[PDB]
Design a binder for these strands. Structure first.
Lengths: 78, 95, 103, 97, 59, 93, 83, 97
DNA sequence: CTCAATTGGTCGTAGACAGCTCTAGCACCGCTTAAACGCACGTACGCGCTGTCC
DNA sequence: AGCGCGTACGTGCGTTTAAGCGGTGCTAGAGCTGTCTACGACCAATTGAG
């Protein structure tokens, strides 16, 4: 799964990030950091979901998790 | 069925007041609704804390004022203070 | 109507409702929701103005999240207000650093 | 002919900063999400919108991280960003302890 | 023009002028004597590490 | 003038933890600040959780999930064990 | 009384001591000026917030509480002073 | 005579101040500075000495943290210590202005 | 199409708000000397590169 | 990135400053308390905006 974040996808992102030249070691680092990130975000989201007694993680759960993380996202309801 | 409320219509009205030309995509409309809710949150939260800091029960227009002056950048706060004073004076000019 | 009474588009009534229900305080003086609605309409006007101007710059009949992101990040004050905010489909500003470009 | 190595890179940066659509393939990200969440709770469901929101936040976070890292590299006077750059970046952000 | 005055004794000949031009286009990146000596010193059979020793060798 | 402080409670705690150890005035002060801080953070998070669930009666469950959100996982686990133990005792009482 | 140039009350050795607690071995002579700059901007922000709180209180005294609230609003919560 | 080699005393100093916790800025200068800046916002403001000391504690801890980040920026090519470019970098990574 | 916004009215109390003081924050002198300044000095680490590696 | 270059800023020291103490005066407005009612909450009856 994790390797589903393909080398080209990470290149594309870093290019959006303005990275001109990339050490190949950046790919596994990016995967690790993204994993950690998701971990935290999803844990918070599920913790809202668990509190709501839901099985479905909703977009609001993700928004509220990000709002906690200091990552406030507009686009899915406030 | 679920009659989920939003500021959509007011965002469109204000857009047509600034730009009668063009419209707004539903995605950008959702982003505007989000932004509205966020700013409302931040301001009402600030005013809440200002009240508690003063032990006051009532969030007045003055609490909102000082909250805006803390929260927004100085110029943006300035203009927001102008707008709020104008609006409150207009409201108190009607009944 | 009260927004009428104040010249506002934003719903003074629903702002008062949300301030009451949001437990922000025991009581919310009737001047407070008028003022907040006015601020929430000066904001939003600010950004929708900038986004419509960007749409003209980008030659578009509709504001799309690109235009909002552009407006927010180009205006230094909105970028101060929204520096900890991310926007769906917004992308990022053109950013290439001087040592990356060729001489 | 041959484009001198690094000349398409800037072109691609220009494209991908022009573009705004999401850059990770949707299903592989979604599956990574379902995997990570399974570790916390079994038989979970995701709204498609919730997955897209996660992907948005993840990508925009990563873009900002890459930006910062790039700046670290430039401070290294390096064109090539490296793991040590990401480490320094996050460290200054105080993400990693 | 101080060069070529040594190489083309009358500029009135266009043919040698237009013949020598491409050697100037090989060198126009260099004007001062000091970078020229750095150039030659760096081609030395025993090039000194410091630039100054390379100049002195080439000098 | 009737300034509430956690001084006595924190004392009691410390007498559990290191009765031979005193707390300086300023250290006590800091602990008071910390206690108030974490109180406000947890309660505010519980409030937002309550809003999200349209629940106007913050229960122990809202505090529990708030604590799981705020505290890092091991500290959270211990805090949960303590909270549920205390609620259990209070329920039996 | 008009107050001016008190930025210079941040003496080079003071910034040095701070850099020492900060783990800086060797300090560029340029840092001292930039450091005064950064400090000024920071103080500006915190003071602006604390002043705004005093104005809301209608108080003519800036209290420790107002600074604490300013710093918490800044996301830099300070313990030791109340709040 | 006797002379410590360069940075020997500096290390001893760092050890010293990381052992101790007092205020490193001289108080009264700081207080005057605060008064000056506040005067720009509003004349005739009285400062509780405690409120001053609080601003000082905050300023010192903030600048010390900043110096920490700056010294972390030193790291590449075994480069040593701190220059204003480092400060600017660290601040921008924080997202400070 | 409909229930959230709306109004005139009462209630009763939040907080206006005015007085009252005395906290502690204002100035102020003035002596001590830690710390600031400034100057010398030098050596080490900030600048440089082309060696060289992919 | 090894190694050269070199002058920046560390260690020192001698002089100058004013930070600190602290001792003393003053005062103003922080905060307290007491009086009133403007006000926002609740309400029933009303309307049409979303």
């Amino acid at each position: 799964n994790i390797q589903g974040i393909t080398k080209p996808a990470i290149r594309r992102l870093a290019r959006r990030g303005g990275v001109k030249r990339i050490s190949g070691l950046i790919y596994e680092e990016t995967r690790g950091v993204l994993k950690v990130f998701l971990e935290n975000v999803i844990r918070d989201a599920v913790t809202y979901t668990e509190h709501a007694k839901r099985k479905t993680v909703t977009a609001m759960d993700v928004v509220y998790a990000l709002k906690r993380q200091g990552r406030t996202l507009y686009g899915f309801g406030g | 069925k679920t009659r989920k409320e939003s500021y959509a219509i007011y965002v469109y009205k204000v857009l047509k007041q600034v730009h009668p030309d063009t419209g707004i995509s539903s995605k950008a409309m959702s982003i505007m609704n989000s932004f509205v809710n966020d700013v409302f949150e931040r301001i009402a939260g600030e005013a809440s804390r200002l009240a508690h800091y003063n032990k006051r029960s009532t969030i007045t227009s003055r609490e909102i004022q000082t909250a805006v002056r803390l929260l927004l950048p100085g110029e943006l706060a300035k203009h927001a203070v102008s707008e709020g004073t104008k609006a409150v004076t207009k409201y108190t000019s009607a009944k | 109507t009260r927004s009428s009474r104040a010249g506002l588009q934003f719903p003074v009534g629903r702002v008062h409702r949300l301030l009451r229900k949001g437990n922000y305080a025991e009581r919310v003086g009737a001047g407070a929701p008028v003022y907040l609605a006015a601020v929430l309409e000066y904001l939003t006007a600010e950004i929708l103005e900038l986004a419509g101007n960007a749409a003209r710059d980008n030659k578009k009949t509709r504001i799309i999240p690109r235009h909002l992101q552009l407006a927010v990040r180009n205006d230094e004050e909105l970028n101060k207000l929204l520096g900890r905010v991310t926007i769906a489909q917004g992308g990022v500003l053109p950013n290439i650093q001087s040592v990356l470009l060729p001489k | 002919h041959r484009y001198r190595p690094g000349t398409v890179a800037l072109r691609e940066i220009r494209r991908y900063q022009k573009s705004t659509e999401l850059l990770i393939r949707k299903l592989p990200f979604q599956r990574l999400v379902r995997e990570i969440a399974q570790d916390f709770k079994t038989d979970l469901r995701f709204q498609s919108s919730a997955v897209m929101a996660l992907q948005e936040a993840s990508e925009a976070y990563l873009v900002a991280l890459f930006e910062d890292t790039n700046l670290c590299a430039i401070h290294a006077k390096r064109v090539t960003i490296m793991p040590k750059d990401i480490q320094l970046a996050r460290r200054i952000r105080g993400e990693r302890a | 023009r101080d060069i070529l005055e040594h190489i083309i004794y009358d500029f009135e000949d266009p043919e040698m002028m237009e013949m020598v031009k491409p050697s100037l286009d090989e060198a126009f990146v260099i004007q001062e004597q000091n970078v020229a000596l750095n150039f030659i010193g760096s081609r030395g059979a025993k090039p000194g590490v410091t630039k100054e020793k390379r100049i002195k060798y080439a000098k």
